[PDB]
């Protein structure tokens with residue numbers, strides 16, 4: 190009864206067997222099948238089991254251990270062994286030389302300045318495969334338990350992992366039997382032309398060329414010497430006196446700007462927010478209603494909570510049984526105004542009392558306008574008035 | 580003799596009195612005036628004596644102490660006292676509510692999330708006034724001291740501060756008298772439409788509107804609640820379940836990108852690199868050559884260093900006096916090939932020996948092509964061959 194409360198809910202009625210449903214983060218589905226239990230379905234997680242790094246980008250660097258080799262006007266070209274260390278970034282320039290700084294001659298002497306580049310912070314691009322993602326789905330049967338209604342905690346339901354690969358999941362719905370699932374990872378957005386870009390806790394789904402065209406230092410998906418370090422390094426020699434080098438500073442904020450609200454996916458508890466869909470097929474044949482032998486409850490009920498309408502025109506009520514028959518079925522029927530002609534269906538099918546002092550929640554779909562909610566049988570049979578919106 | 584060695588040097592000859600010169604970081608000037616000492620001029624610093632902050636921009640923020648007030652479908656509008664704390668950033672949104680999360684009703688209940696914004700790192704924009712800047716200039720007379728040549732240390736010269744305001748500086752050139760200065764801060768780049776933007780050690784000179792159009796949080800030049808914090812804050816409520824807020828991350832690298840090589844000024848030793856010019860007028864009347872009574876040196880000399888050409892066609896030589904007359908003037912003349920007709924002028928005017936064993940440097944301008952450098956008088960008078968470039 191977890192979908193109750195939730196606006197993006199979806200009512201799906203089975204046949205007489207198989208049922209089709211579509212799940213997506215934030216959406217919920219309630220299935221109905223006749224002679225079968227009502228079930229709530231919700232996609233709770235999407236896990237990537239160690240994908241792949243297309244590339245890694247440095248977004249914040251260091252610049253240290255600066256060295257330099259400067260020749261005299263005559264002495265020719267500068268040389269630093271650092272010019273081979275691929276961790277260093279270098280650049281040649283000329284500077285004035287003369288008696289004043291160690292040369293017999295006067296003129297431009299060459300220089301070469303190098304500095305070790307070090308990455309402080311980075312982001313990674315990953316290649317995603319629905320097929321290979323692992324999905325976690327929660328099934329919560331409409332048992333009517335005193336605390337079932339919209340309980341976002343998971344103890345009222347079974348958690349199922351749908352391995353695109355490994356395949357076809359089966360489920361133990363305690364006291365109700367077994368159900369089966371066979372889903373298909375759906376989605377618009379072509380995925381093999383997209384990339385999961387992670388920056389700490391955040392992460393979007395970008396295109397491939399856009400990601401690869403990124404003007405930043407990088408390491409192969411497969412550190413070993415960053416590539417294109419100059420993108421973040423600058424050399425300066427304004428007055429032909431000496432040459433300085435400097436980094437550019439975190440491109441973190443810069444990146445976010447470029448990712449302006451793109452397909453973000455970032456983080457539902459250090460976890461993924463799957464982009465689109467999950468079409469499934471459910472088979473209930475191995476499932477069965479609970480308590481179809483039970484006696485009709487003959488005692489009277491008392492409204493413990495209060496008929497409250499859901500965003501979809503259904504009503505939810507919580508009653509308490511004070512009779513002496515438990516376990517027993519709850520006499521529930523929705524009638525019209527001339528008291529005779531049933532006008533509404535139960536969503537929480539086959540309502541039953543399990544314990545004297547344990548309330549029972551029931552969701553029903555009353556007709557539009559004026560109706561009656563008759564709980565129990567006379568004696569003190571409850572007759573509640575209801576008017577439906579619109 | 581500090582300008583010797585330096586490519587951006589500038590030779591300026593006085594009259595018979597006043598002289599005009601232009602200084603700029605990296606450039607050097609050598610002045611000559613006849614019956615007057617040769618002097619080297621160099622603008623070493625430019626100091627801003629506590630300018631003004633037009634505005635201050637936050638380029639890196641925090642987001643903490645997150646709070647929220649969420650009403651039930653019925654309860655109406657959300658309210659947080661944080662909505663008044665100008666340190667907090669807030670945003671209203673709606674979320675699904677129902678029995679499952681604390682409401683008797685079902686529907687959208689309003690929420691309002693707020694979080695305290697804190698600036699981690701910032702940059703300031705300052706309004707610059709040449710007039711009011713203070714300039715430091717080094718005057719280094721061509722004394723010919725054994726270590727004078729291009730000595731970038733300042734002990735061979737006087738440091739003078741030219742206060743645009745306070746005004747007209749006077750100078751004590753020990754043993755040489757006094758000289759005077761009256762400069763004018765020049766520059767293209769209109770300054771009252773520009774701004775000095777500082778980011779730590781770095782700093783450029785940007786335009787006013789560009790600086791003010793900056794899409795970042797800011798504090799008045801005259802903290803008291805940053806303005807436009809949202810520029811760095813984002814709110815999200817994907818599934819109508821809860822609303823999260825998040826900052827955007829350092830815009831440091833982003834800024835640098837936007838400042839692509841603009842008029843940088845950043846840092847010559849935690850100091851300014853003045854953008855353009857400084858036109859001055861020098862009066863030497865109160866100056867005088869040194870040792871114009873001295874005897875002609877009669878003894879012989881020895882070349883201690885070695886005639887070496889400067890980037891401007893001048894030559895520099897260092898000799899040592901072995902005679903017995905000191906203090907005395909050094910017999911120096913440049914002749915042509917038929918040994919009789921002086922072809923070159925001295926830059927280091929009135930060369931004199933001050934101590935037997937203390938070498939003397941002399942800079943001279945030999946004619947183009949073949950010439951003679953005759954040092955001393957016969958006996959062992961030095962006759963050196965020289966060929967001039969081009």
Ligand SMILES: CC(=O)N[C@@H]1[C@@H](O)[C@H](O)[C@@H](CO)O[C@@H]1O
Pocket residue numbers: 254
């Ligand atoms: C090989 C070398 O140059 N070592 C120095 C190290 O001693 C120093 O702590 C560091 C910070 O300046 O720079 C270099 O790592």
Ligand SMILES: CC(=O)N[C@@H]1[C@@H](O)[C@H](O)[C@@H](CO)O[C@@H]1O
Pocket residue numbers: 336339340341342344345678679680
């Ligand atoms: C949402 C709600 O009704 N609260 C209940 C809570 O009292 C109980 O501890 C838990 C276990 O069944 O389920 C829900 O969390």
Ligand SMILES: CC(=O)N[C@@H]1[C@@H](O)[C@H](O)[C@@H](CO)O[C@@H]1O
Pocket residue numbers: 644
């Ligand atoms: C007024 C208030 O909420 N105090 C808490 C403080 O105790 C805590 O250390 C900090 C970090 O979470 O957040 C807030 O400052």
Ligand SMILES: CC(=O)N[C@@H]1[C@@H](O)[C@H](O)[C@@H](CO)O[C@@H]1O
Pocket residue numbers: 288289290726729730731732734735
């Ligand atoms: C550049 C050069 O010739 N070095 C000298 C140095 O020997 C001396 O200590 C100092 C003081 O006069 O002047 C210069 O620094």
